[PDB]
From a paper:
Na+/H+ antiporters are found in all cells to help regulate intracellular pH, sodium levels, and cell volume. Bacterial [name] is an electrogenic Na+/H+ antiporter that transports 2 H+ in exchange for 1 Na+ across the membrane. The [name]-fold consists of a scaffold domain that mediates dimerization (dimer domain), and an ion-translocation (core) domain, which is typified by a six transmembrane (TM) bundle harbouring two opposite-facing discontinuous helices that crossover near the centre of the membrane. EcNhaA is inactive below pH 6.0, and between pH 6.5 and pH 8 transport rates increase 2000-fold.
Here we determine the crystal structure of EcNhaA at active pH 6.5 at 2.2 Å resolution. The monoLCP-[name] crystallized as a non-physiological monomer, like the previous mono-[name] crystal structure determined at 3.45 Å resolution at inactive pH 412. In the [name] crystal structure at active pH 6.5, Arg81 in TM2 breaks its salt-bridge interaction with Glu252 in TM9 and forms a tighter salt-bridge (>3.3 Å) to Glu78 located on its own helix, stabilized by Glu82 and Glu252 through interactions with Glu78. In particular, the rearrangement of Asp11 in TM1 has broken its interaction with His256 in TM9 and reformed a salt-bridge to Lys153 in TM5, which has also shifted its position. Since the ion-binding Asp164 is located on TM5, there is therefore a direct physical coupling between the pH induced changes and the ion-binding site. The concerted movement of Arg81, His256 and Asp11 side-chains at active pH has caused a dramatic widening of the intracellular funnel. Consistently, we find that only at active pH 6.5 is the intracellular funnel in [name] wide enough to accommodate a hydrated Na+ ion to the ion-binding site, as assessed by HOLE analysis. In addition, 106 crystallographic waters were modelled with one of the waters in hydrogen bond distance to the ion-binding Asp163. We further show that the neighbouring Asp163 forms a salt-bridge to Lys300 at both inactive and active pH, but only at active pH do molecular dynamics (MD) simulations show that Na+ binding induces salt-bridge breakage, an essential step in the transport cycle. In contrast, under inactive pH conditions, the cytosolic funnel contracted over the course of the simulation with concomitant changes in salt bridge interactions, preventing Na+ access to the binding site. Taken together, we conclude the pH sensor is rather working as a pH gate, controlling access to the ion-binding site.
Numbering used by the authors: 10 to 384
The structure:
Amino acid sequence: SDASGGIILIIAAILAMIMANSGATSGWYHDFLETPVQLRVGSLEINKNMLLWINDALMAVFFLLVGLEVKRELMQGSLASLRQAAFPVIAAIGGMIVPTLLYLAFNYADPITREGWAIPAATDIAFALGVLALLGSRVPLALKIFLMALAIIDDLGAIIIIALFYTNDLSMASLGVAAVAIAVLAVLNLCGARRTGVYILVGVVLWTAVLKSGVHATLAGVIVGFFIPLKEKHGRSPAKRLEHVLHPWVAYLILPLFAFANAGVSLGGVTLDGLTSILPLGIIAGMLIGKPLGISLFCWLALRLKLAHLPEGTTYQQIMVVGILCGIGFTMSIFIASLAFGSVDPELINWAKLGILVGSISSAVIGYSWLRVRL
Ligand SMILES: CCCCCCCC/C=C/CCCCCCCC(=O)OC[C@H](O)CO
Ligand SMILES: CCCCCCCC/C=C\CCCCCCCC(=O)OC[C@H](O)CO
């Protein structure tokens, strides 16, 4: 499902680029996405443009899946112990620090564009795993597990740090209702509730309470995915079945719809001097240099001073290639960019997207080349 998921994602992005650039469709594409919307449901109203609504829904579902996965990794997978978590965690710290530092090298003096610091810290898990899948049985499963954990730690870390920066966007009552909802999820888990539906219902309450803040609405999905029990009772667990049923819908519908609504950008007026502007160049440097350099360097240090061990079945060369692949930020990076610039100016988000596209495509091509050499 990895290879076909990546291919369908790329098709949707190409269709977006066609929509945003052809005279027959460009007008409607942009006008529809820009439309202000307010949904009627009692004494509870909220105003957001069409694209933001779409992204909130799609990313709530995607990060519900991310929540299930990270909980499974912390309880059963490669994050279930210090011994196994050391290497992916140190790698993710590097993949966070170095891309941010290279982005801010260009953008720290700009009070507007510095808000996009996390853009090249993101990794498009579907795209990167799809490029891995192109080598088939030559890829050690441990390498895929490593890439998955790395990307999820960086993506969740970005979302969480941004959420902490954005807390002031929520009201006292919103935070209160959210706290009570999270507490209900916790007691449901600790007591032994195993029907997925009850968690989903309390989860939509949590999601609506923090819906004014897109990043918090996204984090709500993670929280719900985290508190759905994973204990294998009689060979069954609601988290396993939910992840299994949800994964195809995310890989084949949610993420392609997101890419179709977000990856299309006009190419008229774009220039070589425009691409070398601080915002797109900071993104490109973060992805093409920051990601592989941070991941490889922090991993090398972890191994040399014996802080961590290579995952069995992998080599350090393979880890370096994964470091390149983690520069494929694509849809996750576009989402981070919408969180930073979405409510500021269309020129900013479009140039951020152009930078993301150059960095992502270049990371994919270079990573696949090195992958063919090493595997
Ligand atoms: C804002 C800060 C960044 C937020 C980043 C979000 C991602 C969180 C997961 C990464 C840490 C992994 C923790 C691994 C801890 C070791 C696990 C352990 O030793 O626990 C033993 C226990 O038996 C277990 O079942
Ligand atoms: C409210 C902030 C709380 C943050 C607590 C996180 C602590 C985790 C540290 C280890 C991972 C490395 C994290 C490095 C994160 C990049 C630096 C950063 O977040 O600051 C960028 C700044 O916003 C540009 O304007």
